[PDB]
């Protein structure tokens, strides 16, 4: 929905050269055992011993599914919002025509 405010808000344009002015204004290594905390690679020493891909994968899989579900509800709502505005506008148009006629 492209949109602008009133003429007063922009207030820069009556023969402005400010834009011209702005241009003038500009004138034994141990990194294997020590990957950074930020990196993906670093697994905590304490957790070094969970040995089951099974349990871990199931929890991970469940989480990976859930994000997609919330995302779907949100994107559909955006779809609904464009359509709602159009429906509303057509109805609005009829009301408005009506309003001017009554005026």
């Amino acid at each position: 929905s492209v949109q602008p405010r009133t003429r007063l808000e922009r207030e820069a344009m009556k023969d402005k050269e400010s834009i011209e002015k702005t241009r003038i204004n500009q004138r034994v290594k141990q990194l294997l055992h020590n990957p950074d905390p930020k990196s993906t690679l670093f697994i905590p020493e304490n957790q070094r011993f969970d040995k089951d891909f099974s349990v871990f994968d199931k929890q991970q899989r469940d989480q990976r599914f859930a994000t997609k579900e919330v995302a779907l509800e949100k994107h559909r709502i955006e779809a609904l919002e464009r359509e709602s505005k159009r429906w509303e506008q057509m109805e609005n148009q009829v009301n408005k025509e009506q309003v001017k006629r009554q005026f």
Partner: protein, 430 residues
């Protein structure tokens, strides 16, 4: 599951790549550090936790621009070892970057391309950017295109080349390597878009009202055109267009794939909101000869096919009502064997604004990619410039001594003559 890889080679290529990569990061909400504070997948890749890595590679033999990139605010974004850099510049010599120093660098670039391609699963195609009037740019672009055409085969490659202006020029030897590079990419690139600087200078002067533009202002407009072209792959739209759906609609014959672009509207915030920017007026402005992005006159030739993209809140019926008006006008005439020549795309996402830039925020925009018969004039004038110095064999010793043969200049001339004859043969009515 749709991806595209962009290749940036040469100083102009890197400087326009920077311009497009601020815009993409801004449009997808990614901070300059690469961290967000499912549409990103076309240009980026997820690392598992946190940052995003662009699907782009920067090439240059001269290290200054890459070093500038690796120290700016975007130092954390790009992968450290995909900014391939050389030591010695080609120095505007085409033979250098095709035979002497480019060969030792091209292998690393091809290894990086393979490492990026194995990650993608739905690779749509490649994008490449290179200023033609330079040694390393033209030479390495030619060599990379020639290697890719055989390594991958039928994958689509798009070239956003910047040809020299009719009279304005920065070098003195750029016609030679421009002609040679046109020879090289004539039989190797699927799409080539014209981008000479003089037309964009005139656009900035007339519309943006800037009397002292620099290269950044030009590159921002080019970045906006790229974003408009590739918006349909990463945003929902009523009438989508894919990259592979081009050679079936804009390329009548395999030889003819040079076309020139235009964009509308181009207007500053100081006087943008005083007028309504209807779809009819913007689609009229896009077809104005003075708003061509390449300094060519469309009134001097026929049209072959027009592919033009909209984005914003445009409604298809308003688009049809404006295509009819253009078909009505007597100053725009299409070729006889093409009854309908328009391909229309509509997208919902409005163009994004870059802070501190020139363009204002608007709800409607149009980008056209048009193939016309009038493009032969740039080839004719480049050929005339080439012949003047090739008559006396000037500057040839700088090329013969870099491994290139004497006869290599003549066959490029013959291919340009063939192209000019083909453009004349196509434009005659039956």
């Amino acid at each position: 599951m749709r991806e595209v890889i962009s290749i940036h080679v040469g100083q102009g290529g890197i400087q326009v790549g920077n311009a497009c990569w601020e815009l993409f990061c801004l449009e997808h909400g990614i901070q300059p550090d690469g961290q967000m504070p499912d549409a990103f997948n076309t240009f980026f890749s997820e690392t598992g936790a946190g940052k995003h890595v662009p699907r782009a590679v920067f090439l240059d033999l001269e290290p200054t621009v890459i070093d500038e990139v690796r120290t700016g605010t975007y130092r954390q974004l790009f992968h450290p070892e995909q900014l391939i850099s050389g030591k010695e510049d080609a120095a505007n010599n085409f033979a250098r970057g095709h035979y002497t120093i480019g060969k030792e660098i091209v292998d690393l670039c091809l290894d990086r391309i393979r490492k990026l391609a194995d990650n993608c699963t739905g690779l749509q195609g490649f994008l490449v950017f290179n200023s033609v009037g330079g040694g390393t740019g033209s030479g390495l672009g030619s060599l990379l295109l020639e290697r890719l055409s055989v390594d991958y085969g039928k994958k689509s490659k798009l070239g956003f080349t910047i040809y020299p202006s009719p009279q304005v020029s920065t070098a003195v030897v750029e016609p030679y390597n421009s002609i040679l590079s046109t020879h090289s990419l004539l039989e190797h690139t699927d799409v080539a878009v014209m981008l000479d600087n003089e037309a964009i200078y005139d656009i900035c002067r007339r519309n943006l009202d800037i009397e002292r533009p620099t290269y950044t202002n030009l590159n921002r407009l080019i970045a906006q055109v790229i974003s408009s072209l590739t918006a349909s792959l990463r945003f929902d739209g009523a009438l989508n267009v894919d990259i592979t759906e081009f050679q079936t609609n804009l390329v009548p014959y395999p030889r003819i794939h040079f076309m020139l672009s235009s964009y509308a509207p181009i207007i500053s915030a100081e006087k943008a909101y005083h007028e309504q920017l209807s779809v009819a007026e913007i689609t009229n402005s896009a077809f104005e000869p003075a708003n061509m992005m390449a300094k060519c006159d469309p009134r001097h030739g026929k049209y072959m096919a027009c592919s033009m993209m909209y984005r914003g809140d445009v409604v298809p019926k308003d688009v049809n009502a404006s295509i009819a008006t253009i078909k009505t006008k007597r100053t725009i005439q299409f070729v006889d064997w093409c009854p309908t020549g328009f391909k229309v795309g509509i997208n919902y996402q409005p163009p994004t604004v870059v802070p501190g830039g020139d363009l204002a925020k608007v709800m409607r925009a149009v980008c056209m990619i048009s193939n016309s018969t009038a493009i032969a004039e740039v080839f004719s004038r480049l050929d005339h410039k080439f012949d003047l110095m090739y008559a006396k064999r000037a500057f040839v010793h700088w090329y013969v001594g870099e491994g290139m043969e004497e006869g290599e200049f003549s066959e490029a001339r013959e291919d340009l003559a063939a192209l000019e004859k083909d453009y004349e043969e196509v434009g005659i009515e039956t």
